[PDB]
Amino acid sequence: GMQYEWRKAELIGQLLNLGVTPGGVLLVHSSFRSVRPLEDGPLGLIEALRAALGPGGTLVMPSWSGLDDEPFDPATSPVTPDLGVVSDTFWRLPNVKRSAHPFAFAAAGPQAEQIISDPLPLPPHSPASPVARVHELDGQVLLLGVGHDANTTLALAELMAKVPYGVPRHCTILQDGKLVRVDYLENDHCCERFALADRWLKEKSLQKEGPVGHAFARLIRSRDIVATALGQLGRDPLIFLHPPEAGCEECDAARQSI
Ligand SMILES: CN[C@@H]1[C@@H](O[C@H]2O[C@H](CO)[C@@H](N)[C@H](O)[C@H]2O)O[C@H]2C[C@@H](N)[C@@H](O[C@H]3[C@H](O)[C@@H](O)[C@H](N)C[C@@H]3N)O[C@@H]2[C@@H]1O
Ligand SMILES: [Zn+2]
């Protein structure tokens, strides 16, 4: 309609009033469809995110390609479309370091290469993943117009709880001039039941909520996400799986994989 185009200074306040603190590590997942309109477009969001964190802060965003038969290059490989414009734009700006593997992240800040310097992580969200370095650095996770279905650290908690299901997934890189398929076993599914973490985090007062632009925003500490999901996965490791009653083809495949 005739909606308010948020300026940079107000976005900073919105970020500060949400819990974003300067000097920290902030991993954000965004759906710009819910943020818009902004006065400066998707760049205006990125500019505010780094303006609130300050120079001593480090902004981290997903930056993987999502393609399994195409090799990855941090200089050209576009972000998968499901990650949004903000993700696809952030890694192209000056001084934004990027991982050199298909499941790459993008980071900018004094701790950037502390986060993205690992080689190909198998599984994609293992320890020694960018998402695990955010955990190790006590970073924050900012859900930006997206639910916990996009919360990547939730998958890190799965492997940290030694979850039984492992489904065969693959990617490809360039080894000495030629392709090669790299087969691994990932712990993915529909990820719909990741929304269960909303009640888990909220009941423990671990999740900050509020507006960032027009989007609904969820801010949770990375270590608080892992810890919360650990205790819940320690109660039932299959709690993120759809029951066979629901007839979810994705989860039923993970279930059959012990
Ligand atoms: C094509 N690569 C992948 C595909 O694997 C494929 O495997 C077979 C061959 O390889 C194909 N025949 C089959 O069509 C397809 O299933 O499975 C899906 C599973 C879905 N949860 C999501 O994963 C998530 C990732 O697992 C997660 O690491 C990341 N955060 C983002 C994605 N949402 O996107 C991937 C991606 O689309
Ligand atoms: Zn499912």
Numbering used by the authors: 0 to 257
What's the publication's text?
Here, we conduct a comprehensive functional analysis of the Antibiotic_NAT family of aminoglycoside acetyltransferases. AG resistance is primarily conferred by three classes of aminoglycoside-modifying enzymes (AMEs): phosphotransferases (APHs), nucleotidylyltransferases (ANTs), and acetyltransferases (AACs). AMEs permanently alter the AG substrate, preventing them from binding to their target, the A-site of the 16S rRNA in the bacterial ribosome. The fold typical of the Antibiotic_NAT family is evident in all structures, composed of 13 α-helices and 8 β-strands, and determined structures superpose with pairwise RMSD’s 0.8–1.0 Å between 197 to 266 matching Cα atoms.
To increase the chances of capturing substrate-bound enzyme complex we used the catalytically impaired His154Ala mutant of AAC(3)-IVa. Using this strategy, we were able to determine the crystal structures of AAC(3)-IVa enzyme in complex with gentamicin or apramycin to 2.6 and 2.8 Å, respectively. In both complex structures, the electron density corresponding to the AG molecule localized to the cleft between the major and minor subdomains of the enzyme. For the AG substrate in both structures, the 3-N group is positioned close to residue 154 and proximal to the presumed location of the thiol of CoA. In the complex structures, the gentamicin molecule spans across the enzyme’s minor subdomain while the apramycin molecule is twisted nearly 90° relative to gentamicin. This difference is reflected in the rotation of the 2-deoxystreptamine rings of each compound. The 2-deoxystreptamine/II ring of apramycin stacks against the sidechain of Trp63, and its rotation positioned the central and III rings more into the minor subdomain cleft and towards Asp67. Notably, these two residues are contributed from the much shorter hairpin connecting the α4 and α5 helices compared to the equivalent region in the other enzymes we crystallized. Additionally, Glu185 appears to be a critical residue for interactions with gentamicin and apramycin as it positions the 2-deoxystreptamine ring for modification through interactions with the 1-N of gentamicin or the 5-hydroxyl of apramycin. Finally, the C-terminal extension of AAC(3)-IVa corresponding to residues 236-257 contributes to the interactions with both gentamicin and apramycin via Glu249 side chain.
